[PDB]
Amino acid sequence: HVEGLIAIIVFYLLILLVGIWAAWRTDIGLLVGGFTMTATWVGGGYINGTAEAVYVPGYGLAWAQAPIGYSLSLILGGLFFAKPMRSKGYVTMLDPFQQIYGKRMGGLLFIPALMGEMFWAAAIFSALGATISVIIDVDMHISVIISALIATLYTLVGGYTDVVQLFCIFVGLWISVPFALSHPAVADIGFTAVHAKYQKPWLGTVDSSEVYSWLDSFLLLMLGGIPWQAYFQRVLSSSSATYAQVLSFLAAFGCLVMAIPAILIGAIGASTDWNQTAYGLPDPKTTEEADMILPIVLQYLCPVYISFFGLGAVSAAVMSSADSSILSASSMFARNIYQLSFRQNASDKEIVWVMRITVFVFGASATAMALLTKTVYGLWYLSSDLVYIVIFPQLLCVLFVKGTNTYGAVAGYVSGLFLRITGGEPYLYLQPLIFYPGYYPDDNGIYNQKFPFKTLAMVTSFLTNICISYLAKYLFESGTLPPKLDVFDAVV
Ligand SMILES: *[C@@H]1O[C@H](CO)[C@@H](O[C@@H]2O[C@H](CO)[C@@H](O[C@@H]3O[C@H](CO)[C@@H](O)[C@H](O)[C@@H]3O)[C@H](O)[C@H]2NC(C)=O)[C@H](O)[C@H]1NC(C)=O
Ligand SMILES: C[N+](C)(C)CCO
Ligand SMILES: [Cl-]
Numbered sequence: 073h074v075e076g077l078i079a080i081i082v083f084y085l086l087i088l089l090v091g092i093w094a095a096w097r098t099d100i101g102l103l104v105g106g107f108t109m110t111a112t113w114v115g116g117g118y119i120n121g122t123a124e125a126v127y128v129p130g131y132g133l134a135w136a137q138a139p140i141g142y143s144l145s146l147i148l149g150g151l152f153f154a155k156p157m158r159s160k161g162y163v164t165m166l167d168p169f170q171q172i173y174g175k176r177m178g179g180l181l182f183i184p185a186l187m188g189e190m191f192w193a194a195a196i197f198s199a200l201g202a203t204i205s206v207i208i209d210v211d212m213h214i215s216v217i218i219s220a221l222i223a224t225l226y227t228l229v230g231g232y233t234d235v236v237q238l239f240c241i242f243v244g245l246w247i248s249v250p251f252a253l254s255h256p257a258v259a260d261i262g263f264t265a266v267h268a269k270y271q272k273p274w275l276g277t278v279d280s281s282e283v284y285s286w287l288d289s290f291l292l293l294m295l296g297g298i299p300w301q302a303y304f305q306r307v308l309s310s311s312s313a314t315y316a317q318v319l320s321f322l323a324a325f326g327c328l329v330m331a332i333p334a335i336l337i338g339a340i341g342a343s344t345d346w347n348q349t350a351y352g353l354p355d356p357k358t359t360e361e362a363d364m365i366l367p368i369v370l371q372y373l374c375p376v377y378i379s380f381f382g383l384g385a386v387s388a389a390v391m392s393s394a395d396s397s398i399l400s401a402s403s404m405f406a407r408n409i410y411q412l413s414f415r416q417n418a419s420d421k422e423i424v425w426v427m428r429i430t431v432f433v434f435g436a437s438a439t440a441m442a443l444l445t446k447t448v449y450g451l452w453y454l455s456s457d458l459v460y461i462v463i464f465p466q467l468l469c470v471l472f473v474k475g476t477n478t479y480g481a482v483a484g485y486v487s488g489l490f491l492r493i494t495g496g497e498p499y500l501y502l503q504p505l506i507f508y509p510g511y512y513p514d515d516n517g518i519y520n521q522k523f524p525f526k527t528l529a530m531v532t533s534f535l536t537n538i539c540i541s542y543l544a545k546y547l548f549e550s551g552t553l554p555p556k557l558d559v560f561d562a563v564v
């Protein structure tokens with residue numbers, strides 16, 4: 073197993089060097105697109121969130137589903153969505169919705185995408201702030217504010233760096249594991265994977281009653297990661313469809329390669345006798361600092377220059393993801409809402425002036441949410457919840473179903489939102505209203521659900537869209553309803 077890992081890391085390093093040379097020169101070129109897509113996809117959530125999920129007792133590796141689902145989402149996109157979206161003149165993911173349903177429905181569907189982008193930005197800001205606070209020894213709120221300011225300045229100024237940033241992430245992450253593994257306080261991770269030396273084994277467990285919840289979460293992560301503007305901008309900006317498919321496949325492979333050292337760092341943190349280090353007792357989890365485990369491992373189990381290399385890798389990943397997130401949000405707003413829904417005649421100066429103010433407002437909101445949070449994996453998971461509930465069924469309807477109307481879209485929107493909201497939300501303090509079978513009280517008194525209700529909400533939204541569209545089409549034609557009642561003008 074060691075030889076295979078060495079071979080794959082050597083192969084990835086060699087192809088990275090080839091990509092760097094090719095990008096400097098600018099046959100080859102499909103490599104640099106995949107590398108840039110990988111740099112866009114992998115950020116603060118892929119590293120700190122994965123380490124925190126592996127480290128926390130009660131989660132383990134079994135419940136760290138996001139790094140695998142988000143990689144499978146790229147494969148699914150390249151398989152089924154890249155070609156249908158490429159030959160219709162679309163510039164934004166919201167264009168088909170506005171062209172088929174209307175501008176108001178596009179504006180309505182804009183909200184979950186903005187919420188997801190905001191959650192992702194908050195998560196990555198929290199990750200970078202925690203790293204800066206631990207390694208440089210600064211107050212956490214100041215560190216988060218500094219990280220947000222640096223990201224905003226980088227995005228504004230930027231308007232083959234991605235390949236070099238990916239190289240920095242790869243080298244900085246992979247150079248730290250050998251030094252942390254050799255510390256005297258760390259035990260054999262192969263033993264502690266199953267045998268519970270200091271805490272529960274870091275390979276988790278799934279009970280016979282939680283299989284449906286596990287599948288529900290996995291489906292949410294895998295299907296909610298597809299409809300994002302950061303991916304579709306790259307898909308639409310390709311020169312051919314095969315180019316986009318190969319780019320998606322290479323990006324997925326790169327993300328899978330990137331995920332491994334974070335899991336190793338989480339296991340190392342879970343296999344440490346902290347009484348033998350300068351951190352001392354209590355443990356990083358007895359103190360409410362379990363989301364800081366990667367910087368703590370870098371600072372207290374590695375030499376100083378290794379910790380600085382890890383800091384540089386985290387900074388590179390966070391910058392490369394934040395730039396794309398902010399740009400996608402601002403572009404979506406400035407094109408689809410401000411210039412299409414109203415004020416259709418606007419000069420180019422007005423558009424850039426709108427873009428800058430949107431960038432600042434989005435950054436401020438993400439900074440506030442990052443300041444108010446206490447977990448990185450939670451926001452990374454939640455960034456795709458409403459996307460999966462709302463946007464995915466309607467994308468399926470517009471791409472592959474003929475006969476969709478504005479009526480079915482309204483019905484599906486309302487039904488999906490109702491079911492999801494009524495289900496409950498244990499991260500907040502919202503309580504369920506339906507109480508599906510298998511509910512149990514938590515430590516905080518909040519009821520959790522063992523029934524897979526989010527997938528049910530998604531399927532209900534899709535089926536309601538189809539059924540209401542065809543019912544309206546039958547009703548307005550063939551008499552029955554006179555034409556004056558066609559308010560949406562969807563059937564005429
Ligand atoms: C964290 O590590 C330190 C360092 O080893 C631990 O300190 C150790 O504490 C034990 C008891 O608390 C000491 O044992 C004592 O030995 C004397 C004989 O010298 C005996 O008469 C006493 O009754 C007691 O058994 C041990 O000497 C001491 N080690 C050092 C180097 O001072 C500490 O206990 C560790 N903390 C935890 C929670 O394990
Ligand atoms: C944008 N997502 C949150 C869906 C994936 C990040 O890796
Ligand atoms: Cl991320």
Ligand code: NA
Binds near residue numbers: 113114115392
């Ligand atoms: Na990145």
